[PDB]
Amino acid sequence: PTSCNPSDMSHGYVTVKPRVRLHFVELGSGPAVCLCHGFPESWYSWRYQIPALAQAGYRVLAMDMKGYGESSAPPEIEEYCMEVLCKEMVTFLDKLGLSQAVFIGHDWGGMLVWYMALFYPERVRAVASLNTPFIPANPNMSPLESIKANPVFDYQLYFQEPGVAEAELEQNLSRTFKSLFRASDESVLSMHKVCEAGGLFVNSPEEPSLSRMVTEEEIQFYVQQFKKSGFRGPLNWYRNMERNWKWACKSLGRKILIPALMVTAEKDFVLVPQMSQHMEDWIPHLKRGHIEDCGHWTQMDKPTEVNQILIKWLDSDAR
Amino acid sequence: PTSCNPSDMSHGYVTVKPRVRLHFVELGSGPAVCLCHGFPESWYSWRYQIPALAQAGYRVLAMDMKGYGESSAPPEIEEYCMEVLCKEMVTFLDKLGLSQAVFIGHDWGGMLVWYMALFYPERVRAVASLNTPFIPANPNMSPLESIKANPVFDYQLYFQEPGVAEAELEQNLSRTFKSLFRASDESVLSMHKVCEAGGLFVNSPEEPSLSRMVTEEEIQFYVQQFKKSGFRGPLNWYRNMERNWKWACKSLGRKILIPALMVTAEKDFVLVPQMSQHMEDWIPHLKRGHIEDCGHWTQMDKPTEVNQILIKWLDSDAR
């Protein structure tokens, strides 16, 4: 599929708060489609979707999420809770004069677009998530308990202490992204042993091989982007679990009534497909896609299948 | 009418050439409408049209023309001929993924959108010009002769020598814009006596009064914008008369077949309405608007009337 050259894109900048601007690349004409990436990624993670969605007749706005790339990375940890992040994306639409837009997210971006649809459905024409399910908050057990119930999320505990995960992820940026951006059959890490091994990469190659999904040039773009603000901002998305839990509990009971799409990935061993099993009970108009042989990095693992699913769903339920 | 706060706008940047980027503000959703200002102005000259057109259901792209504001101001004089300027606006649409857009221009921007429609009609959905008529190039008499035939254009001769007009216009920026941005009944200068008086302002107040059209805050925005690159870039639009004449002659004979609108201003004593008298012979689908009591600075002189005319024409012939 056609990819993106960063130097030949239109770059937009919107100030949503005194010291917080958001950066995005923009391509195409038609209904506004806002793409929201995950951790630890970039607008560039949508490089295969941006020209395809624009050619299909949509105005693509691929964001650099707060803390990433050319977007502002404020220092405060609480600036990265879901309530603040969602309200700024509403201000983002306000400054652009957009009454609403289709929101498509992946990983942490998928969690954001779910709460945009949940708390601001009047501003979301349609919502789609890759890998990330929508599970209503349990007002009876803390996020500290729900993670201890699933050992796959032990890496999230290693991400909590500010400065610890930053030192490992920023020590060798090329090694960091070559070790993370891998197909499921090429994976070189276990999210189980992280807090027992003392880090994500300590039992991984220090000169890892290049995954079949990416080139050296694409890796170096991520390296150059994360030299701007580091990993603190991105990691702060994980450091508001209780805050996000209080906020999500304030919506309990209500359903998401707008058109929605859940795309599961067969080989995402963290955001597994069965975590989305009963989202239809909360999202009546939910449609589904499923990509076999697809790991966590859905957009670059199976870009063609992602483009097919999104364009088919956009043309039918979002137009 | 609702105006624009510069700090609350979405700002876009597109690189159209190695050392040349174009800056624009963007508001609204719908068909793309590209606004092109004149000399010596800014995207801010459309401040009353941008929210109105966006509310009417259009995606407004208000440019900072090359040499102005946050757009690049390359040093070469030939970089401001109409052929180069038009080709970059095509590249501008290319980078944004826009198959075409409605082009609306005023003054030198109106001259540009006419040649965009003339040479690139496949990229112009519809074209509208304020004050500036479309007169086909006479391949028999030079631009040096056509100006000597109309003494109103003597100021253009004063603008030819690089550095001379720059020194007068940049000496006191507040005085420059307060003296220029005036209603026709408040005018304080004669474009007739300029090359005989040795300048535009030499017979004008050195502490001129504030015109009823503008506030001190709006004047100071123009002052701050022109501190970036000065007046050379803007003045270079006038310094390619023969080059623009050769290029326009290469299209001789052909008509503009796309929807078009010519808006004349009753009190524009330079771009007088009768200069547009027989544009229908070259533009078969030309529609017209006329604003009484309106001087050269059409957008800020009669913003309400401009909004009414443009939205009515956009909804009927551009949608």
Ligand SMILES: CC(C)(C)NC[C@@H](O)COc1ccc(NC(=O)NC2CCCCC2)cc1
């Ligand atoms: C965890 C849970 C018990 C459900 N509660 C916490 C949840 O409320 C927080 O929401 C999240 C949503 C999505 C993600 N995605 C990732 O962690 N992807 C990683 C995959 C392996 C490589 C690095 C990135 C994380 C958190």
Ligand SMILES: CC(C)(C)NC[C@@H](O)COc1ccc(NC(=O)NC2CCCCC2)cc1
């Ligand atoms: C001049 C002609 C004989 C027709 N040939 C030259 C033409 O081909 C060049 O095209 C132009 C089109 C529009 C303008 N507008 C202005 O000069 N507006 C000024 C008004 C008074 C205050 C300062 C700005 C200038 C040149």
Ligand SMILES: [Mg+2]
């Ligand atoms: Mg059920």
Ligand SMILES: [Mg+2]
């Ligand atoms: Mg005739």
